[PDB]
Structure formats: C-alpha cells, structure tokens
Design an enzyme around this catalytic site. Structure first.
Site, mmCIF file in Angstrom:
data_model
loop_
_atom_site.group_PDB
_atom_site.id
_atom_site.type_symbol
_atom_site.label_atom_id
_atom_site.label_comp_id
_atom_site.label_asym_id
_atom_site.label_seq_id
_atom_site.Cartn_x
_atom_site.Cartn_y
_atom_site.Cartn_z
ATOM 1 N N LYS A 137 0.766 -1.239 -0.042
ATOM 2 C CA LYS A 137 0.101 -0.074 -0.008
ATOM 3 C C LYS A 137 0.931 1.159 0.059
ATOM 4 O O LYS A 137 0.507 2.169 -0.572
ATOM 5 C CB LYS A 137 -0.909 -0.100 1.317
ATOM 6 C CG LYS A 137 -1.914 1.078 1.147
ATOM 7 C CD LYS A 137 -1.683 2.356 2.072
ATOM 8 C CE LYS A 137 -2.554 3.491 1.563
ATOM 9 N NZ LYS A 137 -1.968 4.763 1.902
ATOM 10 N N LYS B 178 7.208 -0.847 0.188
ATOM 11 C CA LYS B 178 7.199 -1.612 -0.961
ATOM 12 C C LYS B 178 7.959 -1.352 -2.069
ATOM 13 O O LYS B 178 8.191 -2.122 -2.931
ATOM 14 C CB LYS B 178 5.630 -1.996 -1.338
ATOM 15 C CG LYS B 178 5.288 -1.019 -2.588
ATOM 16 C CD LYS B 178 3.792 -1.209 -2.890
ATOM 17 C CE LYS B 178 3.704 -1.492 -4.375
ATOM 18 N NZ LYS B 178 4.107 -2.662 -5.206
ATOM 19 N N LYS C 208 5.147 6.982 -8.219
ATOM 20 C CA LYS C 208 5.988 7.690 -7.436
ATOM 21 C C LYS C 208 7.686 7.461 -7.877
ATOM 22 O O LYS C 208 7.731 6.175 -7.892
ATOM 23 C CB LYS C 208 5.715 7.701 -5.788
ATOM 24 C CG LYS C 208 5.556 6.181 -5.554
ATOM 25 C CD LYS C 208 4.041 5.922 -5.281
ATOM 26 C CE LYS C 208 3.243 5.103 -5.808
ATOM 27 N N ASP D 46 -0.842 -0.306 -9.196
ATOM 28 C CA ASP D 46 -2.024 -0.944 -9.807
ATOM 29 C C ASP D 46 -3.261 -1.365 -8.806
ATOM 30 O O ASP D 46 -4.240 -0.739 -8.565
ATOM 31 C CB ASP D 46 -2.084 -1.822 -10.796
ATOM 32 C CG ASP D 46 -1.279 -1.375 -11.932
ATOM 33 O OD1 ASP D 46 -0.057 -1.024 -11.640
ATOM 34 O OD2 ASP D 46 -1.378 -1.733 -13.112
#
Ligand code: PMR
Ligand code: SF4
Lengths: 262, 431, 402, 264
Positions: free
Chosen positions: D8, D13, D39, D126
């Site tokens: 998230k 991540k 990002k 996504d």
C-alpha cells in the site's frame, strides 16, 4: 445540498476525518449525509458504533434491486443525526472499480438523500484514481483533500488533485482546501498548496491524542475521549462552519515536476 | 489504415526467410496459408539463388480449423526434417498464422526434433522485414552460439550480412579483404554464409564487426553481453568512414592500421577538374538508415554534394538518422509511405535522388537523375559484377554509380543544347 | 495435402485492373498480401496502378466494426482522389477471411453512400479459398450477378483476354455471321452485357470455372469447345461456336483459312527446336491441359504429367478429348512429390512455378516459367506460333549454352 | 522468478524491491528492477538516481521501435544492472485519461528479450481497477508488503484475493507475504497465521532503516549498512529464503473473512 469532495490518500485518519467532520456538521444542528468510501467500513461506522451497512452492503445481500435498500440499512444514521453511507470496493477481481461508488451515489440520489439532507460529505479513496475510481469527484461541488502529513501522502494528494482536474471535464467542481487525516496542521503541505496555487486548510493534528483503527468502535465525536478537548473537536466544528460558507473554492494545478519533494 | 501500393519493408516472416536462406543447413518451417510461398519466388528470382530457399510452408488451403492447422504444421516440421536434413530448424508464424491460434514452438518441441529447433515470435502487424531478419538472427544466436575459448589469432566476426541484401556479397568480400590484409582473420560471417556450426563457433571470435547494423545489431548487443565480444559501430561505406572503421578495428584488435588504398580511385577522381561541376548539387537521400547516413557522409565530404533531405524507411533506426540530419543542417524524414517521399522530392526539387527502387522511379517520372543506395530493389540492382559498397573498392563503386546518372543527363542535355536540337531561335541585329 | 506453391488469387488483380479499367481493387489484408502485390506488379506500381492494400494493423483487428468504419473512410478518400472509378472492388484476402471481415456487407454499406457511380462489388482472391488464376475467375463470377439480362442470342465469351486479341476474335467471329458478341465498341466503359436464357457464353480462358457456374445460374448456355490457344483448339472453338450460334461451316472454311495457314506455319516454324521433348506440365495455374493438347499434337510434343491445382472437367472435357490419354493428370499437388517426379522423369521441358523455375533449371531442366501465358497473348491463330515459340525458347537457350 | 512486490505505501514496498535487487546483485544473478510506480521512488532507492528518465512514456519518440537501443529507457546506475521506471501518465503528469497508462504493459512488450534471470518485478501501483491490472500478466512469485497500519494489511488481503481472481490461467504462486512492519506488531502476526502466508523478512521498518530517507542509499551501497548489519540481516536471508519459490506457502489468502481482527 452543500457537497464537498473529500478524497483520502488511504490513511488511517480517513475515519477520523470523514466521520467526525460529519458528526460536527450535525452537532451544529444540520442534516448529514456522509459518503465515506472505505470497503473495510471504518470511515463512517463509528457514528453508529457497529460496522454500518452501506448501499453496497444491502445491495450485496440482495442481488441487483434497490427496493430492499431501506433507509437505515442502506445509509446508516449515526450519532447526533449523521446518516453516513459508505462505498464497499468491488469484490476481488470482478466488478468495475468505479461501478461500486457510482452505484452508491446513484442510490443516494435515487432516494434523493442528498436533497433530503443538508450535508453531502464525500469521502473517497485517492490512491487509485482511475476514471471510475475518480468518478465520485465530479458529483461533489467543493473538495477538501484529507491526507497524512508526509511526502508519500503529498504525492497521493497531488494524484487526488489531478483526479479533480480530470473530473473538472464534468461541471465546475471546485476545491474548498486541504485538510489532514488528523496528522498535522499542514506544516508539511501548506507551502506545496501554495506551489500548486492552492490552500491547505489548517486542520489541527488529532492523531496526537489516543487513536485506534477508528478509535475503537466510535470516534472522537462519538465517545467520551473526545480527542484532547472539546476544542480539539471544535477544529472539525469550525471546518464544518467553513463548509457551509464554502470559502476558497480555488482549483490548484497539477505539479508533476518533482515538486512532491519525495 | 492506408492504401499501401508501395511498401518499403516486407512482412516480418520475409526477413526471417532472408536470415534462414542466408544460412547453410537451416530450414525455416513456416506456418502460412497456401500462396504465402511467393517470397520463395523473390529469393529465387531477384537474388538468383540456385538451390531453392530452404523454407517450408505448412500451407493450409482451407482446413483452417486449429486441429487441422496444428497437424499441418507438425507434419511439415517433421517432413522438412527428414527431407532436407538440416542441422537446425527455424519455426515461426506468418500473417494469418498469427491470426490462426497455433503454438509455433510447442508443436515443434512436441515432435521431439533431435536437431535444435529455434522458436520464433514475429508480430506480423506491428513490425517489418528488417526487424524480422534481426530478431531471427538474435534467436539463432541464442540457441546455437555459446561462449568458448578465444581463437589464438584475433578473429573478427562479420555480423550482419543476410540474403537478398543490398550487395551483401561483394561487400563482405571487400570487408574480408580489408580485415585480413590488416591481419585479422574472420571466424564466421554469420548469415549470408554460416552453417549452424558457424553460429556455434560465433563465441570464439575476439571482436565483432557489425557490417549491416539493421539486420544484426541485436545479435551484436547479445554478443557483447553474453559472449563478451565488443562490436564495432561505424559502417565502412566511403573513404572517411573506411579510414575510421580501419582505425576502430585496429584498436579493438590491437594491430596496426595499415590500409591498402592503392585501389583508392574515388578521392583522386572526385578531386579532378573533369568533375568540379558537382559542387553545389542538391541530393535527396532516402533508403535504409545505415546506407543513408553513410551516403550522407560520402555526399557531403568526398563529393562536395550539398545534401538537401535525408529520409529513411525503417523507424527502428530513426534516432541516429535525426542525429545525422541535425548534423547536416536538415531534418530527418523518417517515413513509410511513398507519398511523403514524392512530396519531399517535389518540393525540394533535387538534382540527384539517391534512393530505393521507388525513389529511382520517382526520379524518372520527375526527370531527375536517379541512383540506388538502399535495400528495396528489383533483380536489376543485384548485379553479377563485383559491386561492393563498403571498403575502398566500395568507394570506387559509390563514385561511379553516383556520377553515372549525372553524366547521362549532361551528355543528354548537351545533345539537346547542340544545334541538332537548337535550330529554332535566331536574331538579326536589332531583330 | 502438403506444401503448395500456387500463389494467392490476388495475382489476378495484376492483369484484371489492366483488362477491366475503371475498376479499383481494395485488397484488404496484411502487409504480406501488400508485398505480394508489390512484387508481382514489379514495375506496374510505379505506373499509378488501380489496386492497393488496406493494411489491417492490430488496431483494426479486434474491432470488426472499427475496421469497417476505417474501410469506409478509406474508400471515400480513394474515390475523392480517384473520381474516375466506376466499380470499386472489395476483394478479400486471407487475413480478411480469418478476421471474417465480411466485405459483402461492407460493399452494401458503401454501395451508393459515396456516389452510385461506383458499383462496389466483392470477390475474394484470398489464398485460403482460391489458387492463383482462381482470382480472375472469382472476380468475374462476382461480376455476373450484377449484370443485366437479355432477350436475344448473345455470345458471352468472357472478357478476360487482351483487347487486341479480343478485337481480332470479335472481328473474325462477327465475320462468321454473328451479332451480339459482348464487344463494347469503345471497350473503355462498363460493358454491362446482357445475360438471359438465350445468352450463350463461350469459355475463353480455362481458369474461369465459377464464372461458368454463375452464367449457368443466370440461365446462360455454355459451349463445350476446345480452348483457343493453338491451332486445333482455336479451330474447334470457332467451329463449335459457329454451329451453336446457328452459323454454317461453308463460310467458316473461307473466313479463317488464311489464319489457319498462319497458325500452322508459325507452329511448324517454332517447333523446330521442339522435337519430341518431354514436357512435365507442373500444376501451377490449372491452365495446363489446354496448352498440353496443343503441344502434344500440333506442336509435336510428349506430355508426361499435365497437373492442375483444381480441375473443372465441365469445361476441360472438350480440351481433354483431343489430349492423348497417355499423359497423366494430377489433382494431387505437393512440391514434396512434384519435384521428385520431375527429377525422376527427367522431362526436357517443365513448366515449373517461378519460385521453382531457377532451382529446377539448376538441375538440368529447361523450365518454361508459367506466369507468362496468362499475361502474354497466347490465344487464337496469329498467336499460336508465338506460344510454341515461348515453349521452344528454353530448349534453344539450353542448346546455345550447352 | 518474477517477484511482484505488492503493498500500500508509496516509499514502502518500493525501498523493499531495491533491497531485493541489491541482495540479488550481491548474489550475482542479473536483476530487472522495473519500478513504473507513479512515485519516482523505485529506481531511486537502488541507483540513487531519483528520476533518470521516464522515456517509458515514449513521447520524444512516438512508439517503441525508435529506440534502436535499450540504453535510453533502461538504466543501470549501481549493481542493479536494470533499473527502469515508467512513472505512469496520469492526470498528474499529462492528460492520462485512464490512470492505467498501460506503462506496465509497455515494459511487458519492451524492446527485445533481455531475459537474464527473469525479472525482479518491482512494478505495481495498480493494486486493483477493472481493466487496470496489467502487472498480473507476468507475475510469478507475487509478494505483498504491509506496515503495521490495518489499512495496509487489508490491502494485502484484497490484493491476494484479487490476484487469485485474474490468475485463473496465469496461476501465479505467492511464496509469502513479506511485510514492512515497524513496531513488531502482533496483530500482523495473527494475520500472517490467519492468511496462512509467510512473512519471515518483514521486520524491515520505516523508522529503523535510517527512517527510510530519500538522500542516502539502500543495503550494500549506503554507509556502513544499517545498525552495523541490521539491513543485511533480513535481506541477505531474504535472498536465501525467497530467492526462489522453493517454500510455496501460497494458500487461499484469508480462509473465511479473517479480516475482523481490529483489536487495538
Ligand atoms: C521475384 C518476384 C517477382 C518480381 C520482382 C516481379 C517483377 C518482374 N518479373 Mg515477374 N516478378 C516476380 C513475380 C511475378 N512477376 C509478375 C509479372 C511479370 C511478368 C508477366 C513478367 C515478369 C518478369 C519479371 C521481371 C524482369 C526480371 C525477372 O524477374 O526475370 C521483373 C522485374 C518479366 C520477365 O522476367 O520476363 C522478360 C515478365 O515478362 N513479371 C507476376 C504476375 C502476377 C509474377 C508472379
Ligand atoms: S477508470 Fe479506466 S481502468 Fe478503471 S474501470 Fe474505468 S475504464 Fe477501467
């Protein structure tokens, strides 16, 4: 009625912002219709204690019929008179991401709850902002940008702002300002909003006080903790007062040239 | 999308056939409807290959049902095996074979071919023939080639040549002569003369030489990465480029850059009072990107031609071409249709359209001197005589082939200027 | 079953557009059929031809309706750039068949939308149905339904033949007491011949099989006459036509006596090099038996294998009747066996396909490259010794070069 | 061995994938850091180059062919031989339309076969949208990353169910839900037992690793690692545990709605 597009990054303060802003809307004595898109069902569930059934909940219990979407069950009325609906994200894999929230709004209009109420506060996600996912922005008139106070979240709100400009194709949706997910009084965003030709409404940090996922089962306006002070809740009260008068509708401009300061 | 009467490139499977028939002992078992055999005619007649192109066609006349077409493809794979006895097999799909649902490689594996089978993907609706050739090359390099020990004598690889190339034969003769005269031997010219065994030996040469970038560059990059073989970049078309290429291959191999320029006639001949009328002749330059860039250098430097427009038909190499065009004060004209070329020539009104078969004809319709400097050409432009393009003898060729149309025009225009065609005007004092 | 060397039916377009002018051919397909037209035309494409490929990119692959809309836009653009078009042709190709992009309904869609002056018809040169010369057959057979009918004895010999030879044929044939000949005096306008119950069509080029069926559908009457290639073929053709139309033979013997003399003399002059040479008639254009009868009998040849891609015995029986039944025919076509038969039999003259010509010539075989006879005048009397000449050419060239 | 690194958080991540790339480069095997996260923070955390180039939008060139070489679009930077970032063309960067941008698909059909050791597949961003789920097509060992925040673990469970949804034919396995928790949260522990997943290398925090700043580097390349060896401890081991799918803890995600574990 008086409608505001509240777009959350996805921060935990989604509930603390949407539910309690709506609660204050009612505290001053006005009718509330909160649309908090949170498939986990936390953004609005606290005004009723238990997990609210939204449009999607009953529209899931039944297959595709709205006559069994009764008022208290398809829009749960919360504490102090806050009838706060949600949007339960599409079942894993199937169902258009837009379809869910679009149907929430279409059902709220079908019973004319937006006209029945005086608040339409519209809390929807801001991480996934596809045309369907960002469709809820168009329906609302104003817009407040709820978010966490960090650079990941400032990028998230710039994505929100981009979705706002994308939905600006439809009607003339404005932006009341930017608030936080109870994180900080815009010490990390206000100059950015200045950069995008915008203002970030000074929403006092409420995550400093004791918080849970949604403050256990009832948030600051619905339990005895009441954040720090009744003035800490008067922060949301003054935000509601601003949301009737709807100052600063000015629309910012997209800023993709590393202005996020990641 | 468009009414394509002229298409510079061909379908990808044609390029795959170029590579396949370039080799010796490589069958290109191709799924294709009955009639797609026509390209064997192109190879047989334009290039005049004695042996028929070693490619098979699983022609499905009207059993288009997937159960049938798969069986035809399998049967053709095995039949091409024990019929032509190739040392490796090349399998792919062409046009409707892409539309028809087939596993172009799974079946080939399923038939348990003892000889290596190279699976090819050729997207038949977004790529072209040059891509197809290059990709087929990359595939055969991956499957067959393998890193081994460097040869004791520095061995240079002539990567790039294929069949039905623009002078891909006299040219490799010329480049081999230059390289071996400097001393470096050639390990295996990879297509246009390389058994699958030669490809197996591609991992023993020291430094690659990318003859024709377009068809072979991807193999060159893969060579540099896996085989750790540096590949030269400059194409030695002309004299300046030839000197640069000689120096570059000298550095890559650490040898002396001796050049047998005793054959060099083009520099002296261009620098002659006989042919100073060349200075200030706008030349339009079209064709495949490599040949066009090299022709740009030659026309601007060696001949003094002022180049007016440089275009190419392969988008794959557009960026180098726009770089070069910005170098020469022009803007590149990378296109695919003949219409935009016709317009560019019409507007710029050159005096020497060096271009592909179509530019030759555009010239003849417009009455402008024409020449061929690229790949799309009919059988005429594939001569029997020694006609290389790179190397010093390539420079001589370039000189004569480029000058010959202008001389045709001049002596033609003279015979017109002459009294035999000019007894029509007269003046008597003050009229 | 196996590898077939015959090209797509689009190869018909190459001569169709010249012979039937004011007729544009949209061969909707891939870059592959585009290339085939390119190469086959060779030098025509430079001379502003009346065909072209409507390439189907990936974009125009999934959405058939999208492809239809784009095709309509393309057609409008063409007719704007080519107002002289009188009959556009939406000729399908193999990709078009696979995409099942029905050009028939498309022709209905854009029939008179951009002007009723363009009679857009649809046939299919796709290699998945037709084989080489089956293209012109399919084109004319799709022409047939749109044709008007007639109420007179009308000679509908099918106009798939060079205008000079056609003028010769119509001249002699009208001289033989015959009226309506489907010979439009200018030949530059839509012939629009009438096809009624009394219409009598004489098959001129053998490949026109489905045209025969179409005319039979229109109640027209076929003539089972040997095809006008050489001497006996042309003679029996004219004699047959004369009988069926009602003309006697008495005037016929005098009308074409000199032409018969020229045909026989020219064949005798050109078959000097052609003395009992074995011919392997490889199946390339399904035109072979009509040439065979000529070679084997009046040229003095020895047929081995008169093959064919397809065999329309309904119109081939006449021609075969003169053929000596020794020489075998071939309904089974596969180069994997055809080339083996050629190599084993060692025929001195073989009509290989062009892609097989040079390889076969490398194996000590004089190859008559077959793409000519469809394209070059080899019909009727004056052009029978010519035909024998093109056949005697390879052996003479072999003789000179040993 | 495609390792789709789900989650998230933005910087979360995405730092993780760079740590995987650094560990696998120490292991020697070629690594394909395709970030493509909206990002510009995926190749940043490995190369140090925050936004080298965003050519994977392909505006300077019209389509793929124009890039005769990969060098323009793909980048090396550091031991992460292939760090490339698409960035996404949403309404934020340009017009966008759908926030899909299919840039993930552009990297799918990028250039020629630069296979090497398959792909490390930073990718993602996504998570879910009907018709905006491209990275699932090449996912082979998809791994979801979570912090302590309950929204993030809900994000995991949603992603796992969603990948099982489209992976009806792809059938991508998920060897484990390696997380990014910060305060050793026992709620995430109960979840990992609930999800029946594997989460061994989840001690990586957003505070302990130099507060996950954006000025210094990751793993080997940054100064004196982290807490002498804290960064290497979980990540070399991760490159010796999840280095392949030899431990396929892939179950059925949440057996029966095991999300109602809010506690506090
Ligand atoms: C190798 C492919 C090729 C090329 C480039 C052309 C053009 C051309 N093809 Mg033949 N030709 C090929 C194919 C075909 N040609 C076509 C047309 C045509 C004919 C009728 C003739 C011919 C021939 C040639 C020629 C002259 C060189 C040659 O190929 O031998 C070109 C450029 C030409 C010739 O060779 O005889 C003198 C000849 O009279 N082409 C057609 C009919 C659809 C076919 C199948
Ligand atoms: S916004 Fe785009 S990706 Fe999402 S549901 Fe709509 S069309 Fe599909």
């Amino acid at each position: 009625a008086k409608v505001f597009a509240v777009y959350g990054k996805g921060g935990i303060g989604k509930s603390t912002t949407s539910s309690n802003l709506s609660a204050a809307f009612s505290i001053l004595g006005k009718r509330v219709l909160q649309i908090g898109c949170d498939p986990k069902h936390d953004s609005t569930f606290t005004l009723t204690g238990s997990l609210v059934p939204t449009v999607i909940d009953v529209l899931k219990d039944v297959d595709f019929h709205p006559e069994e979407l009764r008022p208290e069950d398809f829009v749960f009325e919360g504490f102090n008179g806050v009838m706060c609906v949600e949007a339960g994200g599409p079942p894993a894999g199937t169902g258009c991401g837009g379809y869910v929230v679009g149907q929430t709004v279409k059902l709220l209009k079908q019973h004319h709850l937006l006209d029945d109420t005086d608040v339409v506060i519209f809390d929807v996600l801001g991480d996934v902002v596809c045309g369907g996912f960002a469709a809820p922005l168009q329906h609302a008139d104003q817009a407040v940008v709820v978010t966490a106070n960090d650079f990941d979240s400032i990028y998230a709100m710039n994505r929100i702002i981009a979705a706002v400009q994308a939905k600006s194709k439809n009607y003339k949706v404005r932006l009341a300002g930017c608030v936080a997910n109870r994180s900080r009084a815009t010490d990390e965003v206000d100059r950015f909003c200045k950069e995008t030709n915008f203002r970030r409404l000074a929403h006092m940090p409420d995550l400093d006080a004791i918080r849970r996922s949604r403050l256990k089962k009832k948030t600051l306006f619905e339990m005895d903790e009441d954040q720090d002070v009744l003035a800490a809740r008067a922060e949301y009260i003054r935000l509601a007062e601003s949301l009737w008068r709807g100052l600063d509708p000015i629309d910012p401009h997209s800023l993709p040239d590393r202005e996020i300061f990641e | 999308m468009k009414l394509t009467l002229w298409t510079y490139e061909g379908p990808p499977h044609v390029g795959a056939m170029r590579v396949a028939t370039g080799m010796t002992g490589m069958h290109y078992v191709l799924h294709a409807p009955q009639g797609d055999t026509y390209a064997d005619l192109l190879f047989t007649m334009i290039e005049r290959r004695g042996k028929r192109p070693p490619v098979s066609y699983t022609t499905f006349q009207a059993r288009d049902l997937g159960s049938d077409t798969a069986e035809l493809f399998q049967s053709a794979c095995r039949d091409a095996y024990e019929r032509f006895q190739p040392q490796a097999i090349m399998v792919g799909s062409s046009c409707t074979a892409e539309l028809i649902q087939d596993d172009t490689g799974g079946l080939a594996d399923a038939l348990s071919l003892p000889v290596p089978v190279v699976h090819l993907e050729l997207p038949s609706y977004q790529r072209k023939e040059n891509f197809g050739a290059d990709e087929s090359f990359l595939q055969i390099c991956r499957k067959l080639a393998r890193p081994m020990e460097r040869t004791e004598k520095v061995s240079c690889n002539l990567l790039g040549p294929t069949a039905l190339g623009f002078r891909h034969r006299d040219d490799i003769l010329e480049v081999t002569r230059l390289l071996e005269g400097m001393g470096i031997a050639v390990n295996a010219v990879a297509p246009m003369g390389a058994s699958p065994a030669d490809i197996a030996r591609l991992g023993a040469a020291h430094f690659n030489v990318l003859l024709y970038p377009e068809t072979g560059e991807s193999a060159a990059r893969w060579a540099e990465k896996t085989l750790k073989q540096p590949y030269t970049k400059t194409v030695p078309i002309g004299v300046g480029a030839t000197r640069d290429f000689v120096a570059e291959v000298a550095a890559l191999a650490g040898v002396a850059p001796v050049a047998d320029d005793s054959r060099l006639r083009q520099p002296w001949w261009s620098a002659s009072v006989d042919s100073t009328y060349l200075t200030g002749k706008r030349v339009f330059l079209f064709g495949d990107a490599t040949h066009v860039i090299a022709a740009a250098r030659v026309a601007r430097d060696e001949m003094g031609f002022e180049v007016v427009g440089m275009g190419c038909y392969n988008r794959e190499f557009a960026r180098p071409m726009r770089a070069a065009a910005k170098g020469y004060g022009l803007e590149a004209l990378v296109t695919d249709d003949y219409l935009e070329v016709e317009e560019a020539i019409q507007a710029l009104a050159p005096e020497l359209i060096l271009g592909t078969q179509m530019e030759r004809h555009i010239a003849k319709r417009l009455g402008i001197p024409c020449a061929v400097i690229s790949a799309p050409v009919h059988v005429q432009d594939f001569p029997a005589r020694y006609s290389p393009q790179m190397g010093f003898e390539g420079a001589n060729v370039l000189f004569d082939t480029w000058i010959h149309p202008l001389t045709m025009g001049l002596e033609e225009h003279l015979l017109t200027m002459f009294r035999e065609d000019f007894e029509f005007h007269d003046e008597a004092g003050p009229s | 079953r196996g590898q077939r060397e015959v090209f797509c039916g689009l190869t018909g377009i190459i001569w169709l557009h010249r012979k039937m002018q004011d007729a544009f051919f949209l061969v909707v397909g891939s870059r592959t059929c585009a290339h085939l037209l390119q190469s086959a035309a060779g030098v025509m494409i430079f001379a502003e031809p009346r065909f072209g490929t409507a390439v189907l990119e990936e974009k125009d692959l999934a959405g058939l309706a999208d492809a239809n809309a784009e095709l309509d836009r393309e057609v409008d653009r063409l007719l704007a750039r080519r107002p002289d078009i009188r009959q556009l042709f939406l000729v399908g190709s193999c990709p078009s068949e696979v995409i099942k992009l029905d050009l028939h309904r498309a022709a209905e869609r854009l029939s008179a939308h951009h002007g009723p002056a363009v009679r857009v018809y649809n046939f299919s040169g796709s290699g998945i149905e037709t084989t080489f010369t089956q293209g012109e057959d399919a084109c004319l057979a799709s022409i047939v339904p749109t044709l008007p009918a007639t109420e007179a004895r009308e000679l509908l010999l099918v106009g798939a033949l060079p205008d000079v030879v056609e003028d010769q044929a119509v001249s002699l044939l009208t001289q033989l007491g015959i009226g309506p000949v489907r010979c439009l005096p200018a030949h530059h306008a839509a012939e629009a011949p009438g096809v009624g119950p009394n219409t009598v069509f004489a098959l001129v080029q053998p490949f026109l099989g489905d045209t025969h069926g179409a005319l039979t559908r229109r109640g027209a009457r076929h003539i089972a006459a040997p095809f006008p290639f050489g001497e006996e073929g042309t003679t029996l053709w004219l004699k047959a036509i004369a009988d069926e139309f009602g003309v006697s033979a008495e005037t016929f013997e005098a009308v074409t006596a000199a032409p018969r003399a020229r045909a026989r003399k020219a064949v005798a002059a050109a078959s000097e090099g052609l003395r009992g040479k074995s011919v392997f008639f490889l199946p390339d254009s399904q035109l072979e038996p009509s040439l065979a009868r000529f070679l084997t009998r009046e040229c003095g040849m020895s047929a081995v294998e008169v093959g064919t891609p397809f065999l329309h015995r309904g119109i081939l029986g006449p021609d075969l009747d003169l053929l000596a039944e020794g020489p075998v025919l071939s309904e089974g076509q596969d180069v994997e066996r055809q080339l083996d038969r050629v190599r084993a039999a060692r025929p001195d003259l073989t009509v290989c396909g062009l892609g097989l010509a040079n390889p076969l010539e490398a194996e000590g075989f004089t190859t008559k490259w077959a793409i000519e006879l469809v394209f070059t005048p080899v019909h009727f009397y004056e052009q029978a010794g010519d035909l024998a000449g093109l056949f005697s050419r390879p052996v003479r060239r072999r003789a000179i070069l040993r």
